Design an enzyme around this catalytic site. Structure first.
Site, mmCIF file in Angstrom:
data_model
loop_
_atom_site.group_PDB
_atom_site.id
_atom_site.type_symbol
_atom_site.label_atom_id
_atom_site.label_comp_id
_atom_site.label_asym_id
_atom_site.label_seq_id
_atom_site.Cartn_x
_atom_site.Cartn_y
_atom_site.Cartn_z
ATOM 1 C CG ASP A 1 -8.096 62.461 2.721
ATOM 2 O OD1 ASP A 1 -9.535 62.665 2.715
ATOM 3 O OD2 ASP A 1 -8.203 61.266 2.294
ATOM 4 C CD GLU B 1 -10.212 63.692 7.422
ATOM 5 O OE1 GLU B 1 -10.448 63.538 7.776
ATOM 6 O OE2 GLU B 1 -9.410 63.493 6.289
#
Ligand SMILES: [Mg+2]
Ligand SMILES: [Mg+2]
Ligand SMILES: [Mg+2]
Ligand SMILES: [Mg+2]
Ligand SMILES: [Mg+2]
Ligand SMILES: [Mg+2]
Ligand SMILES: [Mg+2]
Ligand SMILES: [Mg+2]
Ligand SMILES: [Mg+2]
Ligand SMILES: [Mg+2]
Ligand SMILES: [Mg+2]
Ligand SMILES: [Mg+2]
Length: 1045
Positions: A639, A668
């Site tokens: 994340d 990400e």
């Protein structure tokens, strides 16, 4: 030495005191021009005490009521003496304080306050403001290595000192002198080593401590940097950020050790890193949480770690660390018990850590040690086959009445082979889904694991009222003594729910406070499974249940497992919060802090972590090692990976590859704004490293628009999958050029979003992937397609179906919208990048238009494995985030009917056809970027293209090299994202054949109605997808050579 002291000047009195129906604001002229000073004053909903404030921002005439040598002041008329007022202090129309001030008449009952320019604090008197201006303020000094302090406040000052106090705060005494011990600092030049570690501080003035400084002395309590003039009056004083010197002093020695409650057959060694703590005790608790021992731990001087060694009889014991430690946020030597950041087992709700040996056979399902990864991840060709189904433990089973009730919402639901959900996943796997990606299954904070404190929608409303006082005090309190369940009430609320009465979400927002539902991006402990997903959250039981689930997925469903991990933030920081763990044990070290205030940054959402600091990087790598070795996880999705240094992600990957050589890392890699501090782990910076990143390029080109869209833009911003250009809705203004640009990004993404891939753009120009613009960025960024994860739906932002429902023309009927869903997914599934998709895209999953559903409960996140509907139109979504979209929702929502069993079965068949096609040839998943470049091309490009028709060729002929597929000399992928039939004429004379997989599906195929004529022309119906093949004869043929450009 000269003694440093406060200014020998008189402390200012008040210029005037507020009388009745008045407030007073002093601007204290600390800096050693008053007519241009003025206030902007206004009433709003929260502050409304001002009497007739001047409306016009440009009016600068609210000038000082009076002034003296200590500054101007204003007397302000009020209508009442309670509440608060809004104030901006200005010179002209420029703010002199960046914060928009709120003067609280409850915090300042005399309504007579003082402020200083450039300072956001509100003081009760000019005296207080004066003493604050010449006292310890902010935290803009950085002690970055053994002898170096970086501090703007010390520049051009003759006296620069580091004052310190072990057990109290550095402060001036009653005489006004700073009498605490200090170390003298001298100007110096920053070392290159320090400049490389802290590039964002490299231009700060550098100061040197004596080489014989006792750092351990100073680091045990408060340290304050103090600057003064030659006479010795204080100039400024500030708190000191010490993370850099902590790393320089202790990190190498501490990195060489292992942490946690390390239980083996011979005994147990507990170790916790706490280099600033004054004392650490290990508190052992019985099963009933009574203290049975508190052991002073032993501090290691080299590392600042504390250890305690005992017998194996401590297996299963509960424990916490009792810290005595200065916390710079509170400026107190705090005393508190904290769970182990290296905990590997926990009590219910994470209150105590627990001693465990994860190797113990009692914590393993039968055959665990021999569990193998069902899908290879060794070569790039192996990795390119990855086809991910992003899933959540409750989203899977909370609604499935064929999962046993006691397993709904639990890891163990995956073992319910009789259930609709498990049978559905089994068929997805058989058809070519290869990986399950789990949303947060480490220990999250935001669900209460004590089942008595929780109420879910399947339970009586009376239970909800018992556990949730907000419900019991709400407009829904009349349901308290009904005999209805919460979901029965929500169901009856649907008919009268609308934009003017969003009552479903009104009740559901209250339910969310005390239910079992959260995505879980709220880390409490990084290396223990979440307790609420276990049938028994007390103690070690969840470990075996988690492993049983992993084994079921890998061995019985045949899919690899990826874990989402969230190392970029903690759930909380500071000395008080229940879920602050790391920041209680080593304050100010594990969090990223503002360079001036020392405040924990919140760019991530929450309490930003500092993976650039050595011991947090170690914690991350050590945590991943447990998930890899002890839980047999096959890959990790980071994340907000851009908040991590590139070098830290790569070092973690090096460490984990020694344990599992085929582990896959991706994340990400969006820009995090942290490039001033280190080289970030972003899409561009990771090129060629083998770390994957999600691609936003194809995603937005196919879905249309972007995550920020609201109101009419949600409808205007059509994508390739919803008919940009070719099937416009009534609001859009997209031009043909704009639609063709989205197709350029889509084709580039189907070829793996490579920086160097060469295509013909919408204008006929020859462009590399990096030259196709995406929202002001180079579109193509990767070196190999295995560095790119393509997707058109994910847990965050609206589902694909909801996007199509926002965007599709009114005349696009229900069947067309199902085909739009499949055409959208075809760009991912038939592309060279890794394929990723949200659980339920194959069921047209809806969240009733919810954009951000993390806390929207079972109701809005429902996936119906009984196939009755897709959860569309179950109430307006949460008003706080989607209220701005109610108008457009109401206008689009009812255009066509809601999908039922017919459409869900149709979509599942389309989906399984796409995943089966993806695995049907090695040509779809070449893995190596140079090989993609040598084999992948596009037709129907340039200014004469038929808009919306994507035609990709993959060469297996002699000009490509070796035949990689013995059945074919080439493949054509044709996606006709358009309402017209299209004829392909450029393969005339070659005799293509429709894929046997699509043939076998007959009139249920996405290629239903495709015609391959005698002259070799291929006709595609509207909204169709055809995979055509050049059959390979006795020897490798001519194929579909890439054209020279
Ligand atoms: Mg105004
Ligand atoms: Mg006052
Ligand atoms: Mg210097
Ligand atoms: Mg067993
Ligand atoms: Mg938890
Ligand atoms: Mg209604
Ligand atoms: Mg919740
Ligand atoms: Mg239970
Ligand atoms: Mg910054
Ligand atoms: Mg840009
Ligand atoms: Mg459903
Ligand atoms: Mg071949």
């Amino acid at each position: 030495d000269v003694v440093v002291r406060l200014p020998d000047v008189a402390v200012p009195g008040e210029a005037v005191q507020a009388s009745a129906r008045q407030a007073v604001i002093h601007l204290v002229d600390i800096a050693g021009d008053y007519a241009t000073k003025n206030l902007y004053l206004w009433n709003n909903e929260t502050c409304d005490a001002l009497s007739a404030p001047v409306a016009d921002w440009n009016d600068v005439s609210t000038t000082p009521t009076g002034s003296d040598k200590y500054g101007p002041y204003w007397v302000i008329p009020l209508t009442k003496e309670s509440g608060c007022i809004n104030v901006i202090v200005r010179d002209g129309t420029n703010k002199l304080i960046d914060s928009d001030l709120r003067v609280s008449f409850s915090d300042f009952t005399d309504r007579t306050v003082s402020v200083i320019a450039g300072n956001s604090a509100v003081y009760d008197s000019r005296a207080d403001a004066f003493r604050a201006a010449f006292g310890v303020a902010l935290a803009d000094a950085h002690w970055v290595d053994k002898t170096t302090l970086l501090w703007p406040g010390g520049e051009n000052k003759p006296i620069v000192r580091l004052y310190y106090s072990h057990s109290s705060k550095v402060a001036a005494d009653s005489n006004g002198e700073f009498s605490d011990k200090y170390v003298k600092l001298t100007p110096t030049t920053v070392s290159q080593q320090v400049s490389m570690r802290f590039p964002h501080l490299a231009s700060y003035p550098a100061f040197k401590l004596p080489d014989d400084v006792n750092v351990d002395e100073l680091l045990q309590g408060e340290t304050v940097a103090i600057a003064a003039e030659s006479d010795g009056i204080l100039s400024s004083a500030t708190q000191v950020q010490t993370a850099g010197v902590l790393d320089d002093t202790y990190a190498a020695a501490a990195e060489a050790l292992s942490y946690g409650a390390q239980l083996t057959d011979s005994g147990v060694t507990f170790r916790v890193w706490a280099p600033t703590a004054q004392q650490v005790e290990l508190v052992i608790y019985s099963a009933d949480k009574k203290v049975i021992a508190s052991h002073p731990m032993t501090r290691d001087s080299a590392s600042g770690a504390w250890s305690w060694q005992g017998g194996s009889d401590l297996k299963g014991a509960f424990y916490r660390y009792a810290m005595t430690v200065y916390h710079p946020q509170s400026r107190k030597v705090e005393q508190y018990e904290v769970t182990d950041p290296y905990a590997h087992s926990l009590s219910t709700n994470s209150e105590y850590s627990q001693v465990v040996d994860l190797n113990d056979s009692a914590l393993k399902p039968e055959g665990w040690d021999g569990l193998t990864m069902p899908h290879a991840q060794k070569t790039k060709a192996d990795l390119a086959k990855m086809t991910i189904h992003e899933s959540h433990i409750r989203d899977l089973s909370a609604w499935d009445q064929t999962v046993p009730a006691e397993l709904r919402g639990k890891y163990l639901a995956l073992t319910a082979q009789e259930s609709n959900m498990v049978q559905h996943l089994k068929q997805l796997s058989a058809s070519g889904v290869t990986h399950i990606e789990l949303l947060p299954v480490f220990d999250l904070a935001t669900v209460n694991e004590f089942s008595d404190k929780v109420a879910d929608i399947q339970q009586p409303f009376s239970r909800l009222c018992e556990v949730n006082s907000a419900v019991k005090s709400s407009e829904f309190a009349g349901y308290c003594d009904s005999g209805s369940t919460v979901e029965e009430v929500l169901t009856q609320l649907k008919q009268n729910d609308s934009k003017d009465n969003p009552q479903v979400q009104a009740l559901n927002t209250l339910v969310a406070q005390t239910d079992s539902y959260n995505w879980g991006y709220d880390p409490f402990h990084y290396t223990v499974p979440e307790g609420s997903y276990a049938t028994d959250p007390e103690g070690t039981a969840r470990i075996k249940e988690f492993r049983t689930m992993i084994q079921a997925i890998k061995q019985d469903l045949g899919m690899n497992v990826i874990m989402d991990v969230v190392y970029n933030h903690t759930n909380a920081a500071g000395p008080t919060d229940r879920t602050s763990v790391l920041d209680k044990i080593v304050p100010w070290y594990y969090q990223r802090l503002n360079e001036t205030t020392g405040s924990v940054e919140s760019a991530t959402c929450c309490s930003d972590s500092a993976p650039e600091h050595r011991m947090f990087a170690k914690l991350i790598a050590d945590s991943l090692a447990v998930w890899t070795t002890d839980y047999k996880i096959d890959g990790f999705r980071f994340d907000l990976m851009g908040y991590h240094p590139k070098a830290q992600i790569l070092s973690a990957w090096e460490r984990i590859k020694a344990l599992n050589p085929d582990i896959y890392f991706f994340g990400e890699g969006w820009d995090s704004n942290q490039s001033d501090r280190f080289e970030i782990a972003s899409q561009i910076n990771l090129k060629g490293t083998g770390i994957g990143t999600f691609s936003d390029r194809l995603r937005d080109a196919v879905r249309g628009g972007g995550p920020f869209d609201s109101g009419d833009a949600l409808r205007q911003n059509q994508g390739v999958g919803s008919g940009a250009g070719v099937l416009p809705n009534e609001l859009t203004t997209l031009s043909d050029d704009q639609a063709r640009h989205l197709a350029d990004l889509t084709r580039l993404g189907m070829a793996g979003n490579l920086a160097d891939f060469v295509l013909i753009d919408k204008d006929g120009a020859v462009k590399r992937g990096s030259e196709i613009d995406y929202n002001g960025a180079p579109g193509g960024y990767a070196a190999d397609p295995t560095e790119v994860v393509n997707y058109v739906s994910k847990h965050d932002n609206q589902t694909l179906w909801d996007m199509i429902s926002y965007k599709a023309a009114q005349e696009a009927d229900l069947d067309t919208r199902v085909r739009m869903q499949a055409v959208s997914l075809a760009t991912v599934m038939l592309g060279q990048g890794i394929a990723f998709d949200q659980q339920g895209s194959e069921l047209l999953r809806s969240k009733s238009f919810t954009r951000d559903s993390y806390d929207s409960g079972d109701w809005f996140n429902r996936v119906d494995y009984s196939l009755q509907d897709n959860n569309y139109n179950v109430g307006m979504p949460r008003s706080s985030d989607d209220g701005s979209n109610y108008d457009i929702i109401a206008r689009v929502k009812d255009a066509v009917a809601t999908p039922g069993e017919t459409e869900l079965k149709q979509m599942t068949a389309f989906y399984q056809e796409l995943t089966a096609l993806r695995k049907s040839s090695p040509l779809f998943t070449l893995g190596d970027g140079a090989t993609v470049m040598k084999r992948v091309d596009f037709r129907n490009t340039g200014a004469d293209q038929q808009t919306g028709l994507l035609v990709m060729t993959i060469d297996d002929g002699m000009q490509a090299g070796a035949s990689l597929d013995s059945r074919v000399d080439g493949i054509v992928v044709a996606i006709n994202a358009a309402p017209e039939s299209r004829t392909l004429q450029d393969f005339a004379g070659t005799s293509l054949q429709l894929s046997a997989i699509q043939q076998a599906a007959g009139d249920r195929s996405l290629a239903s109605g495709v015609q391959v004529a005698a002259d070799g022309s291929v006709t595609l119906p509207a909204w169709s997808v055809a995979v055509l093949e050049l059959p390979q004869g006795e020897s490798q043929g001519a194929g579909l050579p890439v054209s020279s450009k």
